[PDB]
Design a protein around this ligand. Structure first.
Ligand SMILES: CCCCCCCCCCCCCCCCCC(=O)OC[C@H](COP(=O)([O-])OCC(O)COP(=O)([O-])OC[C@@H](COC(=O)CCCCCCCCCCCCCCCCC)OC(=O)CCCCCCCCCCCCCCCCC)OC(=O)CCCCCCCCCCCCCCCCC
Ligand SMILES: CCCCCCCCCCCCCCCCCC(=O)OC[C@H](COP(=O)([O-])OCC(O)COP(=O)([O-])OC[C@@H](COC(=O)CCCCCCCCCCCCCCCCC)OC(=O)CCCCCCCCCCCCCCCCC)OC(=O)CCCCCCCCCCCCCCCCC
Ligand SMILES: CCCCCCCCCCCCCCCCCC(=O)OC[C@H](COP(=O)([O-])OCC[N+](C)(C)C)OC(=O)CCCCCCCCCCCCCCCCC
Ligand SMILES: CCCCCCCCCCCCCCCCCC(=O)OC[C@H](COP(=O)([O-])OCC[N+](C)(C)C)OC(=O)CCCCCCCCCCCCCCCCC
Ligand SMILES: CCCCCCCCCCCCCCCCCC(=O)OC[C@H](COP(=O)([O-])OCC[N+](C)(C)C)OC(=O)CCCCCCCCCCCCCCCCC
Ligand SMILES: CCCCCCCCCCCCCCCCCC(=O)OC[C@H](COP(=O)(O)OCCN)OC(=O)CCCCCCCCCCCCCCCCC
Ligand SMILES: CCCCCCCCCCCCCCCCCC(=O)OC[C@H](COP(=O)(O)OCCN)OC(=O)CCCCCCCCCCCCCCCCC
Ligand SMILES: CCCCCCCCCCCCCCCCCC(=O)OC[C@H](COP(=O)(O)OCCN)OC(=O)CCCCCCCCCCCCCCCCC
Ligand SMILES: CCCCCCCCCCCCCCCCCC(=O)OC[C@H](COP(=O)(O)OCCN)OC(=O)CCCCCCCCCCCCCCCCC
Ligand SMILES: CCCCCCCCCCCC(=O)OC[C@H](COP(=O)(O)OCC[N+](C)(C)C)OC(=O)CCCCCCCCCCC
Lengths: 168, 171, 347, 98, 98, 96, 83, 316
């Protein structure tokens, strides 16, 4: 059952989404989105992306999601619909999991397969480097245009937010 | 479509070189300065044929030179070499700089017994040329003929015949 | 707001739209949209009142959702074709989300409920940017991916926009809402001819921008935002009522004014493709637009509405508003029909 | 496609439906908006890593940087909505009907 | 592009990451470099109307190397047949497959 | 002090990298024979498993082209032990 | 000449931290242009052999390409052993 | 054997934290002209054990928390993450030999803010929330300088591997070429772990967030907090005081490396006894107006310095 680690994580990934998509109180909604983020990194790590997976923890979970929780505790004033949506979500997940595990082929918009994610991995690698790392480091040698527009947007984010929040 | 052709289990059989990565890494520098010619022919075959089934015979020649290379060490410099890769094998990273003292003995032993000179820094990374009788492949990608281009427009650009010809406009 | 920061924010709105138009990569197209939405919110919040805050919120949620759908189309297109180039999409499901993402950004029906409300809650100058400049970026992408757009989807969004823009405008007295519904109606024409001749999509866009910019400029000069407040203009600036009459008649497509040119050329490019029912239905439904335009002509220029006593104090001061390019825009909005064959410069 | 893609692709659908059905809180919907980018982040990274599209390994990071900048702009509006009506309820934002 | 500023100025703003067979750092190839190259060279210059018909063979191969749909169907068939014969005493896996 | 030591470390990296280059020809030859053998081993089992199926060709390519295509994990370790498959798929990612 | 001294001696007294920050950042932008060893950084980076040196088929007219690694022809890392 | 390895790392950590409480109370005592614990066992060697038993058989409060599930999640997360930050530390051989270990420690360290934020919610007290917000704003502010300073140091090392920092310092400590960064790294670690002169949480007369906790749950927050004090000082010694590694005598490394890690942990106790406390607005200005301008400037200097001297480290 360790060969299907990626699929097991993806199932937990969806269940978390059904958690905060049903929209419980914001405190619990943010809690469910942290669980999905951690599971999301786990999936990316098992596909060979280590820098990308860790960037999720540092920037997404330890960054944005901290600001989300920080802003919730200060501007949120700490039902049947929630339970109804949550139960509806799990049932659809169960049936999708049930069928892809029975006949190993499901057609919903796209043709999905059920053999196992491991069957599409590359079979040959003998490099003395990390291919993912080389691509990201190319941001400075190849992505000159990307660096300029991204940096300017971040600078404008500082200017814009101060304008919006002044109130006068 | 077609049927993928594969060589037979008896066409792949060859005498393997069963020595650990520490043994290879200890003899790597001398190995690359002695078996360069059979090695580079095989690599030229792979980067040109782009198909491992087309370079099996060159592959066996690579194996034979390695077996013959290690036998010469087995005859003349065995204790110095066995003591060299034992120190390399001890480190988790298999570092050269931790075993300079044992390297000198093995390097000196081969020099006297076989006249082997260790290549200098930057030699094994040089692009070289290999003389091979194997013909150059013509269509290595097995590509079909490209669709012919559209007819090109050529001639003199004369003014429009009576102008725009848009409804009632006369020019 | 500091004047220098106002210039910087505006140039970032332009830069976002320019990045979309000069990019051969879907990531830079998406970055262009994001830089555009980030910069335009501060000009909508500039007056610091609850209505502006509500308008900026409804705009953010709509444009944020649209951008997420667009990025989902790009990734699906990457999975099925292994490339990022800005061209026809290679999956029908990617095309639907891409076509629907752009429809939401444009404001086409039935993704239209935010255009009347956002345009109403922001100043006139911000509305002018929203209804003219913000339409360039989505139309640039449609110009490039039209070979793969679902015909029944693009023509269905076009027809609903023409209808909903027409009926929505009849029941309005606020000027900002009238232009918003007018903007929805004209979008349907631009996307109706897109499968057949994209050149006429640009011509209708160019003409619409010129005419719409003229109307907002004249409203801003007198600080008029309601039908009644606009009816005092005859007693303050008589000339400005004659210019409003001419532009309103132009926007309705009445010959021999400029606004008849796109409606004329779009009907031509659809009858060549044996499309007879749609152009007729489109042309007849456009009479709804001409109606509530004519209503403003009755209460502004063709009749003299009641005035107030304090109006006499206004006669002693001039107009100090900029009214930039107003003389040039008004002439281009009314007197360009004899130059119709010039549309070939857009090819 | 593959078995993992189904759940990632179904996680985007859940968040989209969650974003299109507001309950009361504005903060709740912003989470559904940041869930959408998380699914897109994972789905793109899976495609890029598996195909050895080396130069595209930087794209998911750019997706994360802009999506977080957009999220910051969203939270700022939520704060300014709460400083006016005392809560982040969407039903309060109904002045523009007329 | 709507405006071809890059071609006019001869500046490569974003064309280096459009395709996965372009120049990659350290010459690292993508898994489907050969298939992408073949389709690109087939469809070059003849417009997309013709390429949709006269380069369909290459395109189907490229899409087979991307999503591997046909291969997974074939492996799935073999696994079922082996499983069916396994639970009847009619098959015997060889020693090196166990 | 840092400049000197870093410069010595680059000369050491080249020495370590050149050892890999000197060995790649031998490792490439071994890998080619190991990949082909596993493909042939699967070919035999496919023939036995599907000798009586309604219209099945043994070892039929799914590509129109006849060019060599690198096998994926499913084609090599399709019918092997889970432990061996687990090592060849997640072994590197899970090592320490 | 006296205006600058008065200005510099005032920030050095009231804002020593900022004065240090700009001096350090200013050196990071200037010295690489004037440094004679910046060219050796590129040569070291180009000399590192990550990939395999694929050999070239011999045609006869290639006197600058060695037939063996230990031949004297081709690029040399002698400058690196002495750096 | 790996499972035995994990326990050989966890239990000694907790024991070290237990006796750090004693050492802290006695070093503070002698700097104050007194003794500290010397009655409960010889030289107070049984004082830590008495304190542990007392807390775990004392009745807990568990007030009417708004959730009652965050109240139990907060100490699990704090202690769980605190032990996890030890697994990649080379002493000299890591339990888990990560390639991006330095980045792993930043990632896990930035998650410790949730236990501060969650415990604020659970307390159900409006005032206790304000204290949690100030603590959270302090932690995120000072991990901006931890990330940039670490990046500057790694430019002289070449990788995010923690064991490569040992090779980098095989001729000389990094404290010599990068002492200005070491100063701002050392102070940034005090602010992260809410240590004097940066302990506003425990700094009564202005506020703490863990005020509603007593007995065992309180000890769990305490244990996690002190394990982070040891861990950050072990990180500092590896980063700036590299110890030479002899593969044949690895114990030689561990003894020297432990002595450095202790001396840096005692420096934390030394600094607590010597200075008064910062004001909240004053430690924020120490970061956004003094450290950050220098950290950004030194980052520019350290990106360019290796290039202009031809001293770029190897990638591997
Ligand atoms: C052929 C196509 C022809 C159609 C052209 C249509 C142009 C019509 C423009 C509207 C007329 C201007 C006006 O009445 O003022 C309204 C308004 C001022 O009224 P306000 O609300 O009382 O003051 C606002 C603040 O309080 C500001 O108050 P402040 O005191 O702080 O002042 C800030 C400072 C600021 O000064 C500036 O405005 C300069 C900013 C740089 C503009 C870009 C320069 C282009 C060259 C670089 C590239 O000064 C001004 O604001 C001057 C007043 C505005 C007059 C100058 C407007 C120039 C527009 C012409 C260039 C069009 C480029 C697109 C516009 C940008 C799109 C987002 O100014 C605007 O913001 C209008 C923006 C224009 C948006 C529509 C642009 C047309 C889109 C189609 C483009 C062509 C493609 C087809
Ligand atoms: C290519 C050739 C294009 C020629 C452009 C040269 C005129 C632009 C500069 C004029 C200007 O200051 O305002 C332009 C521009 C628009 O201001 P405006 O209020 O519309 O100008 C009328 C005022 O009454 C202006 O009254 P003012 O007293 O404030 O200033 C008198 C102005 C008088 O200059 C003028 O004549 C303004 C009117 C010139 C025409 C404006 C439209 C530009 C041409 C558009 C062409 C459309 C072609 C359509 C063809 C379709 C059929 C094929 O003299 C100048 O400033 C010339 C300075 C030379 C530099 O001002 C700016 O914000 C940008 C500077
Ligand atoms: C569980 C209880 C909650 C745990 C919270 C902490 C999460 C641990 C961090 C994830 C592991 C990691 O960082 O990998 C880095 C490291 C990075 O190491 P690396 O990049 O150096 O590569 C290691 C291997 N080499 C070097 C050979 C390439 O990952 C690994 O070393 C191995 C990856 C194993 C992947 C298995 C992950 C499954 C668990 C993930 C789900 C987590 C759920 C979280 C629940 C929600 C709470 C936030
Ligand atoms: C100002 C107040 C705060 C300052 C904090 C001061 C405490 C931090 C420690 C500073 C003193 C340095 C540790 C000295 C004791 C270390 C014992 C030891 O490891 O062996 C001696 C160590 C032995 O050296 P080594 O084993 O660490 O290896 C040195 C590495 N090379 C060879 C690259 C330089 O040397 C000394 O520290 C002598 C002093
Ligand atoms: C050739 C190229 C060379 C390039 C590099 C050149 C570098 C030149 C030197 C630059 C300055 C060096 C930076 C030092 C850090 C300055 C930070 C700063 O902001 O200072 C002002 C700051 C505050 O300055 P301030 O409060 O006095 O005022 C700031 C400015 N005004 C007046 C406008 C407000 O000082 C502090 O950081 C306060 C310290 C808090 C208490 C810390 C307790 C110290 C305990 C002793 C620890 C000793 C270190 C142990 C290290 C152990 C490591 C293993
Ligand atoms: C595909 C399957 C989709 C349908 C699945 C239905 C899942 C929702 C379950 C019903 C539900 O949510 O509860 C009833 C719903 C809202 O809950 P309700 O009890 O009415 O809350 C206020 C009561 N005073 O009450 C309603 O208003 C009905 C909402 C539509 C359902
Ligand atoms: C569940 C019941 C169902 O199957 O509905 C499928 C419906 C039509 O899709 P169709 O492909 O025709 O069904 C396959 C039949 N052989 O289609 C549906 O109802 C599926 C609803 C999907 C809503 C899409 C919202 C936009 C997001 C698009 C991203 C792709 C998501 C779909 C693919 C992943 C599957 C969840
Ligand atoms: C070419 C590539 C590099 C291009 C870099 C261009 C971008 C630079 C980005 C810098 C970062 C942004 C900082 C800009 C703000 C400057 C400070 C400021 O805002 O001015 C405030 C100050 C207020 O004045 P006040 O307090 O009333 O009175 C005392 C003032 N001294 O008013 C003042 O009087 C401050 C005076 C202006 C500050 C000038 C700073 C110049 C820094 C350059 C120094 C380089 C020297 C390097 C050589 C060192 C050799 C040892
Ligand atoms: C030898 C030659 C060395 C170069 C000459 C020295 C540099 C000159 C500039 C230094 C003076 C800076 C101006 C200044 O004095 O700022 C003081 C002012 C403080 O104001 P404030 O703290 O609020 O007052 C409190 C009173 N109760 O502060 C301000 O008002 C604004 C200060 C903004 C500072 C921005 C810091 C960000 C830049 C960090 C440096 C990174 C490098 C920048 C790029 C450099 C490119 C070369
Ligand atoms: C309300 C429920 C919502 C949906 C979640 C379902 C949880 C209960 C399990 C029911 C479905 C099922 O059949 O469970 C079983 C599956 C097993 O999958 P696998 O490891 O890939 O097995 C395939 C490999 N073989 C062939 C060895 C079996 O469990 C999961 O994948 C984990 C679900 C998350 C917990």
């Amino acid at each position: 059952m360790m060969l299907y680690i990626v699929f097991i994580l993806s199932v937990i990934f969806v269940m978390g989404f059904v958690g905060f998509s049903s929209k419980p109180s914001p405190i619990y909604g943010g809690l469910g989105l942290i669980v999905s983020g951690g599971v999301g990194c786990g999936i990316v790590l098992n596909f060979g992306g280590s820098f990308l997976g860790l960037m999720v923890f540092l920037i997404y979970l330890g960054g944005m999601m901290v600001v989300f929780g920080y802003t919730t505790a200060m501007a949120t004033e700490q039902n049947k619909a929630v339970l109804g949506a949550f139960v509806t979500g799990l049932l659809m997940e169960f049936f999708m999991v049930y069928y892809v595990l029975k006949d190993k082929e499901v057609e919903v918009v796209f043709e999905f397969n059920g053999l196992g994610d491991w069957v599409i991995y590359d079979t040959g690698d003998s490099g003395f480097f990390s291919e993912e790392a080389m691509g990201i480091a190319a941001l400075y040698s190849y992505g000159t245009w990307l660096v300029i527009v991204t940096g300017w947007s971040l600078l404008i984010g500082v200017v814009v937010i101060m304008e919006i929040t002044r109130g006068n | 479509p077609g049927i993928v052709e594969l060589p037979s289990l008896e066409d792949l059989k060859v005498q393997e070189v069963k020595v650990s990565s520490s043994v290879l890494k200890a003899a790597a520098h001398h190995y690359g300065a002695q078996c360069d010619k059979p090695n580079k022919e095989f690599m030229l075959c792979r980067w040109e044929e782009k198909d491992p089934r087309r370079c099996l015979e060159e592959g066996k020649l690579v194996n034979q030179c390695a077996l013959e290379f290690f036998r010469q060490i087995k005859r003349h410099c065995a204790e110095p070499f066995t003591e060299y890769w034992t120190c390399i094998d001890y480190s988790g990273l298999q570092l050269f700089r931790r075993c300079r003292k044992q390297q000198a003995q093995f390097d000196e032993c081969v020099l006297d017994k076989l006249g082997w000179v260790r290549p200098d820094l930057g030699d094994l990374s040089k692009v070289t040329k290999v003389k091979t009788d194997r013909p150059l492949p013509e269509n290595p990608y097995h590509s079909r003929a490209r669709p012919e281009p559209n007819p090109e427009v050529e001639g003199d650009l004369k003014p429009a015949r009576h102008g725009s010809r848009l409804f009632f406009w006369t020019m | 707001m500091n004047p220098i920061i106002f210039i910087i924010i505006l140039l970032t709105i332009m830069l976002g739209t320019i990045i979309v138009m000069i990019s051969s990569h879907w990531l830079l197209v998406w970055i262009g949209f994001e830089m555009n939405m980030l910069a335009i919110i501060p000009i909508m919040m500039k007056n610091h009142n609850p209505r502006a805050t509500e308008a900026s919120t409804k705009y953010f949620l709509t444009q944020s959702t649209a951008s997420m759908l667009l990025m989902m189309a790009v990734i699906i297109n990457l999975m099925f074709s292994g490339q990022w180039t800005v061209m026809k999409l290679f999956n029908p499901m990617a095309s639907m989300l891409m076509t629907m993402a752009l429809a939401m950004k444009l404001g086409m029906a039935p993704f239209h409920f935010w255009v009347p409300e956002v345009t109403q809650g922001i100043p006139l100058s911000s509305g002018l940017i929203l209804l003219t400049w913000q339409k360039l970026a989505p139309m640039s992408v449609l110009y490039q991916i039209f070979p793969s757009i679902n015909l029944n989807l693009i023509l269905t969004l076009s027809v609903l926009s023409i209808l909903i823009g027409g009926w929505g405008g009849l029941n309005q007295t606020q000027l900002r809402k009238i232009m918003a519904y007018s903007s929805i109606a004209h979008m349907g024409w631009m996307t109706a001819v897109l499968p057949y001749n994209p050149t006429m999509t640009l011509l209708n866009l160019i003409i619409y921008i010129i005419m719409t910019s003229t109307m907002f400029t004249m409203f801003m000069a007198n600080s008029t935002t309601t039908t009644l407040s606009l009816s005092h203009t005859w007693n303050k600036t008589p000339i400005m009522t004659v210019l409003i009459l001419a532009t309103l008649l132009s926007m309705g497509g009445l010959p021999p004014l400029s606004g008849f040119m796109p409606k004329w050329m779009i009907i031509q490019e659809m009858t060549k493709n044996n499309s007879i029912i749609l152009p007729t239905f489109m042309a007849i439904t456009a009479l709804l637009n001409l109606y509530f335009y004519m209503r403003l002509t009755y209460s502004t220029t063709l009749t003299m509405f009641p005035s107030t006593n304090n109006m006499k104090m206004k006669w002693q001061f001039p107009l100090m508003k900029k009214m930039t390019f107003l003389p040039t825009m008004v002439v281009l909005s009314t007197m360009m029909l004899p130059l119709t064959p010039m549309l070939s410069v857009l090819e | 496609m593959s078995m993992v893609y189904m759940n990632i692709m179904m996680a985007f659908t859940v968040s989209l439906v969650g974003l299109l059905m507001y309950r009361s809180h504005l903060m709740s919907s912003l989470l559904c908006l940041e869930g959408m980018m998380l699914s897109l982040f994972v789905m793109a990274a899976l495609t890029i890593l598996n195909s050895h599209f080396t130069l595209a390994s930087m794209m998911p990071i750019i997706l994360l940087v802009f999506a977080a900048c957009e999220a910051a702009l969203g939270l700022s509006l939520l704060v300014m909505v709460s400083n006016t009506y005392g809560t982040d309820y969407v039903q309060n934002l109904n002045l523009l009907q007329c | 592009p709507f405006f071809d500023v890059q071609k006019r100025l001869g500046v490569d703003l974003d064309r280096w990451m459009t395709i996965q067979s372009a120049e990659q750092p350290h010459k690292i190839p993508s898994r489907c470099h050969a298939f992408e190259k073949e389709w690109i060279e087939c469809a070059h210059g003849i417009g997309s109307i013709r390429a949709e018909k006269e380069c369909k063979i290459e395109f189907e191969d490229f899409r087979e190397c991307l999503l591997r749909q046909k291969t997974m169907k074939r492996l799935h068939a073999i696994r079922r047949q082996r499983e069916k014969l396994i639970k009847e005493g009619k098959y015997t896996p060889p020693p090196h497959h166990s | 002090s840092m400049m000197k030591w870093n410069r010595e470390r680059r000369r050491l990296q080249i020495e370590d990298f050149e050892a890999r280059i000197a060995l790649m020809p031998l490792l490439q030859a071994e890998k080619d024979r190991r990949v082909l053998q596993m493909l042939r081993e699967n070919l035999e089992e496919e023939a036995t498993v599907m000798k009586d199926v309604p219209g099945w060709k043994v070892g039929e390519s799914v590509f129109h082209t006849t060019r060599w295509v690198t096998p994926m994990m499913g084609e090599l370790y399709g019918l092997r032990a889970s432990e061996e498959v687990l090592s060849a798929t997640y072994g590197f990612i899970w090592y320490t | 000449a006296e205006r600058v001294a008065a200005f510099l001696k005032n920030v050095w007294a009231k804002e020593p931290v900022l004065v240090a920050s700009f001096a350090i950042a200013g050196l990071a932008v200037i010295l690489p242009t004037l440094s004679p060893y910046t060219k050796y950084s590129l040569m070291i980076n180009r000399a590192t052999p990550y990939n395999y040196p694929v050999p070239l088929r011999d045609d006869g007219n290639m006197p600058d390409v060695p037939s063996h690694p230990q031949d004297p022809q081709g690029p040399s890392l002698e400058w690196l052993k002495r750096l | 054997m790996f499972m035995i390895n994990i326990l050989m790392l966890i239990i000694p950590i907790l024991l070290a934290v237990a006796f750090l409480t004693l050492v802290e109370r006695k070093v503070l005592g002698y700097m104050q002209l007194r003794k500290g614990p010397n009655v409960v066992g010889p030289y107070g060697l049984l004082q830590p054990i008495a304190d542990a038993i007392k807390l775990f058989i004392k009745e807990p409060l568990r007030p009417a928390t708004s959730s009652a599930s965050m109240f139990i999640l907060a100490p699990i997360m704090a202690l769980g993450l605190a032990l996890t930050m030890w697994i990649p530390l080379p002493m000299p051989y890591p339990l888990i030999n990560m390639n991006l270990g330095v980045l792993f420690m930043l990632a896990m360290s930035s998650l410790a803010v949730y236990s501060i934020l969650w415990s604020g919610w659970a307390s159900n007290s409006k005032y206790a929330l304000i204290g949690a917000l100030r603590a959270v704003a302090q932690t995120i502010s000072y991990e901006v300088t931890l990330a940039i300073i670490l990046l500057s140091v790694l430019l002289m090392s070449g990788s995010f591997t923690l064991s490569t920092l040992i090779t980098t310092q095989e001729q000389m400590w990094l404290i010599l070429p990068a002492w200005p960064l070491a100063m701002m790294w050392f102070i940034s670690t005090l602010a992260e772990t809410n240590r004097a002169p940066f302990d506003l949480t425990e700094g009564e007369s202005e506020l703490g967030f863990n005020v509603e906790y007593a007995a065992g749950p309180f000890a769990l927050f305490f244990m996690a907090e002190y394990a982070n004090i040891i861990m950050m000082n072990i990180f500092t010694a590896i980063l700036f005081l590299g110890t030479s590694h002899n593969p044949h005598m690895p114990e030689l490394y561990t003894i020297n490396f432990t002595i450095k890690s202790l001396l840096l942990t005692m420096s934390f106790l030394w600094i607590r006894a010597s200075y008064p406390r910062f004001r909240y607005d004053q430690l924020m200005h120490l970061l956004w107006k003094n450290f950050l301008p220098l950290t950004l400037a030194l980052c520019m200097w350290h990106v360019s310095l290796p290039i202009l001297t031809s001293g770029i480290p190897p990638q591997t």
